[PDB]
Amino acid sequence: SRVKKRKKYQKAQKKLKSVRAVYSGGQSGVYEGEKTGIKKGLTRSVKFK
Amino acid sequence: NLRNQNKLSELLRRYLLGLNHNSDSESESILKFCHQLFQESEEKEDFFLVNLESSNSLLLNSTLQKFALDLLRNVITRHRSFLTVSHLEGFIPFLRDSLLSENEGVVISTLRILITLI
Amino acid sequence: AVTIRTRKVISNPLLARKQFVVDVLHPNRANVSKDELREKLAEVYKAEKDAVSVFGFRTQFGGGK
Amino acid sequence: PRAPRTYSKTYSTPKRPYESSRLDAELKLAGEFGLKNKKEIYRISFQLSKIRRAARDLLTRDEKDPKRLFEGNALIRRLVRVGVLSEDKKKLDYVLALKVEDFLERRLQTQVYKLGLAKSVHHARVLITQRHIAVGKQIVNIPSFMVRLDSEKHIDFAPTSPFGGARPGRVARRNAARKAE
Amino acid sequence: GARGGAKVVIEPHRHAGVYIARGKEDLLVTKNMAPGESVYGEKRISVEEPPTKVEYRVWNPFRSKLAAGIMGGLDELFIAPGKKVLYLGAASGTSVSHVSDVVGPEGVVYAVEFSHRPGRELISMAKKRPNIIPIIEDARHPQKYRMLIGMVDCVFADVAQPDQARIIALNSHMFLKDQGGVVISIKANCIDSTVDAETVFAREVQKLREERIKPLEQLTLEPYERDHCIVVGRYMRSGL
Amino acid sequence: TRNIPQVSSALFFQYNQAIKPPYQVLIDTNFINFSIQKKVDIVRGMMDCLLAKCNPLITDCVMAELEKLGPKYRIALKLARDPRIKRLSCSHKGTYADDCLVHRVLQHKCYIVATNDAGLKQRIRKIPGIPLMSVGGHAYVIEKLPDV
Amino acid sequence: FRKNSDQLYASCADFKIRTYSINQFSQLEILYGHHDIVEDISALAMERCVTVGARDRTAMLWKIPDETRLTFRGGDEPQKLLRRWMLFFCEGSIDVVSMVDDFHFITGSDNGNICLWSLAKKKPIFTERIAHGILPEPSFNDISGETDEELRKRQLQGKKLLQPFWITSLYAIPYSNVFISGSWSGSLKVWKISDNLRSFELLGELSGAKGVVTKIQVVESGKHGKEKFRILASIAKEHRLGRWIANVSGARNGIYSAVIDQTG
Amino acid sequence: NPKAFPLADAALTQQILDVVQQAANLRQLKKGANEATKTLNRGISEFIIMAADCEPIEILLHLPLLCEDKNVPYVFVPSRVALGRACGVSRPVIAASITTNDASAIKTQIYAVKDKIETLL
Ligand SMILES: [Mg+2]
Ligand SMILES: [Zn+2]
């Protein structure tokens, strides 16, 4: 059981990265830009009504 | 409450009458005792703390001040030798302060002693 | 090496003996036989082996004592 | 016959075990602390519920009550001794603020992981169950061992362990013998 | 990634005064007020235009939290060309220079700082940028530097203080125009490490509301930072 | 510009890893009324329910609606104004409480919603990671709170 | 070594004390309880050895037969020492220990405090603060590189950077009323304990030694009435554990010797 | 006024030095000025400890400028020989850094001293 839950948790961690971005230690080395790119016309932010 | 204060005022009066018949009243230690009584008279945390429930210091000082003045006047009247400028020089700064006090009881006793020292 | 310690010693002249608790430290060894402990206790107490009795030995979890 | 002897259950099934919230909380907790099954989480939850119910009942009572003072002081003492409750928070109100995660932190497995003796929580469980870990002079083979503040500094490799200074295990000496042969 | 010999295509961002450098990767870049130098050793994009050689500076989100906001997609930014900005907590030319880049020559930036030692660098960097006004003062007492400050459309508070709400309100009341701008960075650890981050964030939103700030937006700054968010609001002098 | 709200960092999927004692709880107008009917104290019946300190919170909307109820509900207004009950300012025109409570919870994932209204509850239950509190039978009940 | 016995007690950096039998050439027992490195150990005719745990700031007496331990902690705070007076340096680590008696022992700390102990009392019975004095103040020409002398003096921060000498060595003659303390001050100090074993005073000093006193030993000869005592102290240019301390001017590597004759 | 400022009182230093020794045992300690600069540049430092008796003091005044700019608490200690003692290295140390780790076993002690340093600052 312990191994099964270990694989289940680490699998869950991978899916968490997809649903929302997560801190991953910050910047490592020279800043090489946004690897996945920038989206100009999209806002992730939640509005106060 | 006011009723209890009146009860206390009676009790303090009874102690004063006892002091009059007390041998210590004839000693000079009582003058020092009066002198002493004058100078003592003169968010984050709340976020954690459970709460389940839906200033008498000025009165205390006045009560002591009333007792000291009433004790001082009686001793000097009963014992003439204590009624001297040298003995009562130190109490003058208390008398002037007492004259300005809000309570009418203490100022009256302040007037009673001042008439004695006139 | 092996150490033998005796504690809580009570003199019992009613039974004409001495009672005590025996602790045996035996690093790097399984445990100590009763006859061997009787021999060493006899040596320590300066009495015959026949007059020494030992029992109730339980090795603690993890060994060595 | 011989007198009865008492026994008790150390855990209780949760009210609704099929709440998704409970399932995901348990997933996170087991993964973080390498717990074998949900019975461990239920045990810790039961203990915490008992403690917090006691603390609530104490907080009900008037302050300076003999019962409140005595048994609350005892509870704070036990909680600080286990290390769950910090020294600066010695009040029942912070007891009501306690959590399962802290008792899980005080488990021996988490501590062998944290101190650096093991590279992972599961590796720490293996090492503890395997008879490689000693608190002070005593070998502890139980991951659920709750360590105290003083006992925290005494966690090390056992003298008998191959990692602690004893001879190599069977695999190592077998391979060495085959290599020499 | 962006190795020194690579070329890049520059195109404008949705926000005025902000640009994107396309390529194998994407970089947020602002045009340099003072060309030929870097404030803090950042990579710089030189572009030839009819020919004059204009230069752009890269904006590092991990080092500038305002940049992390544009990365995360703030819907609206009050900082824009031709706007006066009051930068509180201006440790150095880290973000003030980039903020100064956005406002441009016509705009101005009022940089406020407390400790003297960074002020030396802020003054030196400020001399290269005529539009930046460094105010080496304690922000908890705006009346100390009421002298040097006019109205400002947007007040950007970078202060890492437990009482950050009070300083914002005092500065906003004195200098911020009606319908004016406020952009705040909140780090929950500094304010209250005892409670979780989100309980803290809700608390300052309430503290903003009592101070006649209507909050418009909030955004968390991950993956660039942990336990941080940027809240955007508007100042209703009359009432909420 | 297209806007799609971010998923709150407080939620591991639909598990809220942020809400934690002491709890912050939003009070609905019906919650106060029903509590008086069942003779359950607000602060304690919540403390008994969750075995933790509770920080009751009332917005301007719910306070306004309580005032509008009239003299018949004079008791509820007095309990709502107990000093332990902290107050939340509102910056939206409408005095409708149901939408205000829903908007607040959507944004900050720290609040439990204390209400018995069927319509309001359904909207809350759809929002992930939101514990929902109600008064039923003899005492308070909490639905989506894993730590219990 | 246990006095008049082959038993040996070894203090190791692994936070443990090991016991050996030299005649038998075997290890006997390992003792646990120290939270930090066990820097020093002392023993007398009894099996009751004492140790100090350095940064843990605890002195430990071990009863080998009983398998029990007594814990001693200084528990002094510069804060309280000042109001009762109305430079005091808090103890950082206990480095040396010597057993004056089976029922008494002394310790030396890195704040220059020599403390007397009794088994009955967990707290020190008597203390001698800054026994060896204060270290020389750092030179103003080296503290800073500014030209103006006054600027350099401000970096000295008055007397607040000053720190006391450490008690590198501390030895007491068994079952006597005198013990010797050592440091790199450049002198060995001789202390005499009171008859009631409640306090001690400075008997005198020997300034011959120059350098770090790593260890002190004393030997006696002559008739039981008339004895001559020879104090042998190891002197080094660096601390035994390592090379932290700055070089001491005039320090040399050698064996310091002092013969003290007894008359009265 | 002095360049070395703030410099801790006696009681605080032992609390600081106690944490340093624990951090050294747990591999959470970076020792020496050069490492401290790297940790500040990486944003991996809880706080910085420094020696006020460094000869000259000047060679470590670059760190506070870095520490403030990243809002990292910093503090001086009177003795460099004593600071090396706590670090576990055989030699004097003029500057040291505590690396950030929320999973460390000494998190409470590190945050305990860290709170005191800010009050000092
Ligand atoms: Mg084995
Ligand atoms: Zn509202």
From Swiss-Prot, chain B:
It is found in: Cytoplasm; Nucleus, Nucleolus. It comes from the Eukaryota. HEAT repeats lie at residues 86-118. Belongs to the UTP20 family. Interacts with snoRNA U3. Interacts with MPP10. Component of the ribosomal small subunit (SSU) processome composed of at least 40 protein subunits and snoRNA U3. Involved in nucleolar processing of pre-18S ribosomal RNA and ribosome assembly. This is U3 small nucleolar RNA-associated protein 20. It comes from Saccharomyces cerevisiae (strain ATCC 204508 / S288c) (Baker's yeast). The chain holds residues 1782 to 1922 of 2493 of the full protein.
Curated annotation (Swiss-Prot), chain F:
Its main location: nucleus. One of its GO terms (cellular component) is nucleoplasm. GO terms for biological process: endonucleolytic cleavage in 5'-ETS of tricistronic rRNA transcript (SSU-rRNA, 5.8S rRNA, LSU-rRNA); endonucleolytic cleavage in ITS1 to separate SSU-rRNA from 5.8S rRNA and LSU-rRNA from tricistronic rRNA transcript (SSU-rRNA, 5.8S rRNA, LSU-rRNA); endonucleolytic cleavage to generate mature 5'-end of SSU-rRNA from (SSU-rRNA, 5.8S rRNA, LSU-rRNA); maturation of SSU-rRNA. GO terms for molecular function: RNA endonuclease activity. Keywords: Nucleus, Ribosome biogenesis, rRNA processing. Interacts with FAF1. Belongs to the UTP23/FCF1 family. FCF1 subfamily. This is rRNA-processing protein FCF1. It comes from Saccharomyces cerevisiae (strain ATCC 204508 / S288c). The gene is FCF1. The chain holds residues 41 to 188 of 189 of the full protein.
UniProtKB/Swiss-Prot annotation, chain G:
WD repeats lie at residues 1-30, 33-72, 89-127, 163-201, 208-254. It is found in: Nucleus, Nucleolus. Involved in nucleolar processing of pre-18S ribosomal RNA. Required for efficient pre-rRNA cleavage at sites A0, A1 and A2, and biosynthesis of 18S rRNA. Present with 5130 molecules/cell in log phase SD medium. Belongs to the WD repeat RRP9 family. The WD domains are required for nucleolar localization and U3 small nucleolar RNAs binding. Interacts with UTP25. Component of the ribosomal small subunit (SSU) processome composed of at least 40 protein subunits and snoRNA U3. This is Ribosomal RNA-processing protein 9. The chain holds residues 288 to 572 of 573 of the full protein.
Curated annotation (Swiss-Prot), chain H:
It is found in: Nucleus, Nucleolus. Changing V77L: Impairs binding to U4 snRNA, but not U3 snoRNA, and causes pre rRNA processing defects and an accumulation of unspliced U3 snoRNA. GO terms for biological process: box C/D sno(s)RNA 3'-end processing; maturation of SSU-rRNA; maturation of SSU-rRNA from tricistronic rRNA transcript (SSU-rRNA, 5.8S rRNA, LSU-rRNA); mRNA splicing, via spliceosome; snoRNA guided rRNA 2'-O-methylation; spliceosomal complex assembly. Its main location: nucleus. GO terms for molecular function: RNA binding; U3 snoRNA binding; U4 snRNA binding. CDD domains: SNU13. GO terms for cellular component: box C/D methylation guide snoRNP complex; nucleolus; nucleoplasm; nucleus; precatalytic spliceosome; small-subunit processome; spliceosomal complex; U4 snRNP. Pfam families: Ribosomal_L7Ae. InterPro entries: eL8/uL1-like, H/ACA_rnp_Nhp2-like, Ribosomal_eL30-like_sf, Ribosomal_eL8-like_CS, Ribosomal_eL8/eL30/eS12/Gad45, Ribosomal_eL8/Nhp2. The keyword Nucleus applies. The keyword Cell wall biogenesis/degradation does not apply. Changing E55A: Impairs binding to U4 snRNA, but not U3 snoRNA. Causes pre-mRNA splicing and pre-rRNA processing defects. Keywords: mRNA processing, mRNA splicing, Nucleus, Ribonucleoprotein, Ribosome biogenesis, RNA-binding, rRNA processing, Spliceosome. Belongs to the eukaryotic ribosomal protein eL8 family. This is 13 kDa ribonucleoprotein-associated protein. The gene is SNU13.
